[PDB]
């Protein structure tokens, strides 16, 4: 089950 | 989706507990609390994922199954009155869906009620007249049964230099039938309300 | 930023036996960035039916890819892999050697 | 034993083509099991192992939605990275991400992983405490301050201790290793010499060791070898070779160490 | 962290264009446009994930947006409709919370013939209140204005005050139609009795602007402030 990144971008 | 009660009442100084139910929450969804003073811009209060959270304005507790939470406002001021929105916010998602939220009212601690109805005099044109119902405890008042007598809702002012809060409402009319002694008959006012003799 | 040129191996899926169906592999690995061009040649001619694994990478972040085609080894047909990458001044070619 | 799940993500920036090329590959115990590619005719997550084909339709629906989320996350992050490094013009800007979880026999999270690279170099990584970040340079230090301010680590730690371990558990019941098969081939060289090539085929995982010996002793001769390579069917190949005198080659032994074997193999080329 | 929005109030004729502007100087990647009808919820019109990366929210019909730089986000109504009368809030985010601007109240009117500025009167404290409580309440009435586009404030010796002040949260209609709004200012009786103390009730009315053509006969109800004032006095 894939990780969806925390919405704060690089 | 979250579920909150429609409204909540407290007096200044008390601790306030705002509950929120969210039984279909998912593991990636944060619990966010925003507040909005009416017609003003909404304002972030706090948020958390599971671990309880304390900050300058509030405490958040999240149940260990994460299906409900509660916002805790330690020593509410009059300035904390507002609509409080509990909203789920996916950790990867920028959107929020606001609901109806909880309307929190907070009434002042009136130390020495001196309920009275005064007549105020226009500082320019004369025969213009206004009635000020003031200094009553937090027990409400309603509009007139006469488009002829305009009655304001109660309004809390805060003299911060002293420690002094006071309720007031205003009433006015163009009639000569209108007098300050009858202005607030449709309200439930104290039996000892002071009516200065003209 | 670091760019790395691809290491190339050319070999068969199974030990090559003349007249037996097999797979010819061009394994390209250790490269960066991922833009790469890989052609499988039979007697100098580019083979049309070439598929490839999905782009992945290693702990050092360098990419790797397998390009494969089905083929039947003969005794004297000859195979190579041809690779172009931004780190290369000209395409690099690696001969298929069935003993290797 | 020590089970694991990994997702290897790559985004390659594109010009006025707005969306970067975005690829994601998922592994269970170092074996590919799902794949997403943005350059497909219809970008979808797909099974890459026969045992994943039993998952329900909603699973593939949820996963494909998360891929479109990642694609946008990498797109904005690549634009940000472009500005962190001032000019620095290139037709290739690559952001890579590795994440996943090592699972113990006790079924708790053993190690959680989250690492980023930009342009082929370490950029930023979550430390093993799953609470602090290691930043490789000035640009990654901007990112780190930003993620400390917004609490990014807590989101990633929650995934690593929770969803990651939980679905790893389930996959290991869905598809409820493969030891090498070895042999020696024999290649005469000139002037009474011959090459002995020890092959290991059909094994998985890739990790293997091949050694030539003479009567339990390692040879001082230098061993010719080949990097471990995929066969293309999910297994790997390796060989090590050695040059010995013609007529003496029966005395030399190849050893093959692999975790799929209880004991390491010993084999030789036997003459008639 | 500050999101900026101008103007606070705006009158537009039906069928005219509208451009609402939002700024944030922290260069957050994502910005939002919301609208809120009174007594209802905030609804997302459009979200901007980055320059030229805009997506419809829940109620996109009748609006479009422009995001050419990260620092601004504009909402465009190509032909204003009366049911677009509302409060519009823009927001921004870096990845943590959203920061909201102070909002713009737009009123879209078929006709401007019913736009009126307030009349402002100050009512002085009663002698009875003074001797009974040793405090003095001034009442300000802002009267006969339309639409509901006013900001009332109290100025004491030239300084804006918020302490001891309460203003009605909602206006009331004079024919339950023009509005009326009341505010109170309470000071100590001794402060009121000093003739050197100056009190001013100021109400800012957001009405018509210059390019708003007016065809009626009476005085153009432009954007203006209307004031009433009084000095303390030893009664
Ligand atoms: Na938390
Ligand atoms: Na009090
Ligand atoms: Na009008
Ligand atoms: Na107002």
TrEMBL record, chain B:
<protein>
    <submittedName>
        <fullName>T-cell receptor, sp3.4 alpha chain</fullName>
    </submittedName>
</protein>
<feature type="disulfide bond">
    <location>
        <begin position="131"/>
        <end position="180"/>
    </location>
</feature>
Automatic annotation (TrEMBL), chain E:
<keyword id="KW-0732">Signal</keyword>
<feature type="disulfide bond">
    <location>
        <begin position="140"/>
        <end position="201"/>
    </location>
</feature>
<keyword id="KW-1003">Cell membrane</keyword>
<keyword id="KW-0325">Glycoprotein</keyword>
<feature type="domain" description="Ig-like">
    <location>
        <begin position="118"/>
        <end position="223"/>
    </location>
</feature>
<keyword id="KW-0479">Metal-binding</keyword>
<dbReference type="GO" id="GO:0002376">
    <property type="term" value="P:immune system process"/>
</dbReference>
<keyword id="KW-0472">Membrane</keyword>
<keyword id="KW-1015">Disulfide bond</keyword>
<feature type="binding site">
    <location>
        <position position="149"/>
    </location>
    <ligand>
        <name>Zn(2+) 2</name>
    </ligand>
</feature>
<feature type="binding site">
    <location>
        <position position="132"/>
    </location>
    <ligand>
        <name>Zn(2+) 1</name>
    </ligand>
</feature>
<keyword id="KW-0862">Zinc</keyword>
<protein>
    <submittedName>
        <fullName>Human nkt tcr beta chain</fullName>
    </submittedName>
</protein>
<feature type="binding site">
    <location>
        <position position="151"/>
    </location>
    <ligand>
        <name>Zn(2+) 2</name>
    </ligand>
</feature>
<dbReference type="GO" id="GO:0046872">
    <property type="term" value="F:metal ion binding"/>
</dbReference>
<dbReference type="GO" id="GO:0042101">
    <property type="term" value="C:T cell receptor complex"/>
</dbReference>
<keyword id="KW-0391">Immunity</keyword>
């Amino acid at each position: 089950s894939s990780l969806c990144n925390f919405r704060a971008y690089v | 989706k979250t579920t909150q009660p429609d409204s909540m009442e407290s007096t200044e100084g008390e601790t306030v507990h705002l509950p929120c139910s969210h039984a279909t929450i998912s593991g990636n969804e944060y619990i966010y609390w925003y507040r909005q003073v009416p017609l003003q811009g909404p304002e972030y209060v706090t948020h958390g994922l599971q671990q309880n959270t304390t900050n300058s304005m509030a405490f958040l507790a999240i149940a260990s199954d994460r299906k409900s939470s509660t916002l805790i406002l330690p020593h509410v001021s009059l300035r904390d009155a507002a609509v409080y929105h509990c909203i789920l916010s996916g950790g990867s998602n920028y959107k929020l869906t606001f609901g109806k939220g909880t309307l929190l009212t907070v009434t002042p601690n009136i130390q020495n009620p001196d309920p009275a109805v005064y007549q105020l005099r226009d500082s320019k044109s004369s025969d213009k007249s206004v009635c000020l119902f003031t200094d009553f405890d937090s027990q409400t008042n309603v509009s007139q049964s006469k488009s002829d007598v305009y009655i304001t809702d109660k309004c809390v002012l805060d003299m911060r230099s002293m420690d002094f809060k006071s309720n007031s409402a205003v009433a006015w009319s163009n009639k000569s039938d209108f007098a300050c002694a009858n202005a607030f008959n449709n309200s439930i006012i104290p039996e000892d309300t002071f009516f200065p003799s003209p | 930023m670091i760019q790395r040129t691809p290491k190339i191996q050319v070999y068969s899926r199974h030990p090559a036996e003349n007249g037996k169906s097999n797979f010819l592999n061009c394994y390209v690995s250790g490269f960066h960035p991922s833009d790469i061009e890989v052609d499988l040649l039979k007697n100098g001619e580019r083979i049309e039916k070439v598929e490839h694994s999905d782009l992945s990478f290693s702990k050092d972040w360098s990419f790797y890819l397998l390009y494969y085609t089905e083929f039947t080894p003969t005794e004297k047909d000859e195979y190579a892999c041809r690779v172009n990458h931004v780190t290369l001044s000209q395409p690099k070619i690696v001969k298929w050697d069935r003993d290797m | 034993g020590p089970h694991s799940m990994r997702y290897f993500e790559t985004a390659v920036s594109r010009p006025g083509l707005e969306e970067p090329r975005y690829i994601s590959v998922g592994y269970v115990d170092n074996k590919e099991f799902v794949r997403f590619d943005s350059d497909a005719e219809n970008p979808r997550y797909e099974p890459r192992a026969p045992w994943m084909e039993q998952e329900g339709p909603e699973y593939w629906e949820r996963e494909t939605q998360k891929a479109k989320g990642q694609e946008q996350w990498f797109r904005v992050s690549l634009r940000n990275l472009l500005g962190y490094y001032n000019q620095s013009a290139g037709g290739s800007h690559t952001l890579q991400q590795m994440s996943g979880c090592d699972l113990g026999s006790d079924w708790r999270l053993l190690r959680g992983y989250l690492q980023f690279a930009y342009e082929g170099r370490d950029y930023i990584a979550l430390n093993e405490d799953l609470k602090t970040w290691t930043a490789a340079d000035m640009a990654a230090q901007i990112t780190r301050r930003k993620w400390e301010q917004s609490g990014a680590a807590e989101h990633y730690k929650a995934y690593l201790e929770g969803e990651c371990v939980e679905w790893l558990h389930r996959y290991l019941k869905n598809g409820n290793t493969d030891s090498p098969k070895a042999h020696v081939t024999h290649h005469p060289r000139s002037k009474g010499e011959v090459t002995l090539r020890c092959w290991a085929l059909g094994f998985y995982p890739a990790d293997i060791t091949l050694t030539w010996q003479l009567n339990g002793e390692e040879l001082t001769q230098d061993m010719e070898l080949v990097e471990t390579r995929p066969a293309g069917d999910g297994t790997f190949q390796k060989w090590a070779s050695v040059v010995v005198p013609l007529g003496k080659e029966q005395n030399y032994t190849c050893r093959v160490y692999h975790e799929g074997l209880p004991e390491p193999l010993t084999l030789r080329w036997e003459p008639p | 962290m500050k999101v900026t929005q101008m103007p606070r109030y705006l009158i537009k004729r039906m069928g005219e264009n509208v451009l609402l502007e939002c700024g944030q100087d922290m260069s957050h990647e994502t910005m939002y446009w919301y609208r809120q009808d009174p007594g209802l919820g905030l609804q997302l019109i459009y979200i901007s994930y980055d320059v030229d990366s805009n997506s419809e929210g829940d109620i996109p019909k009748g609006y479009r947006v422009s995001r050419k730089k990260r620092e601004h986000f504009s909402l465009i109504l190509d032909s204003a409709k009366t049911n677009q009368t509302s409060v519009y809030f823009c927001a921004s985010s870096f990845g943590r919370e959203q920061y909201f601007g102070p909002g713009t109240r737009l009123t879209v009117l078929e006709d401007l013939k019913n736009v009126f500025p307030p009349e402002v009167a100050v009512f002085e404290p009663s002698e009875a209140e003074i001797s009974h409580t040793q405090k003095a309440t001034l009442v300000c009435l802002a009267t006969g204005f339309y639409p509901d586009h006013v900001e009332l404030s109290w100025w004491v010796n030239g300084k804006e005050v918020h302490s001891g002040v309460c203003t009605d949260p909602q206006p009331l209609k004079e024919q339950p139609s023009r509005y009326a709004l009341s505010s109170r200012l309470r000071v100590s009786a001794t402060f009121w009795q000093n003739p050197r103390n100056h009190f001013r009730c100021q109400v800012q009315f957001y009405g018509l602007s210059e390019n708003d053509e007016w065809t009626q006969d009476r005085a153009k109800p432009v954007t203006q402030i209307v004031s009433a004032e009084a000095w303390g006095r030893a009664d």
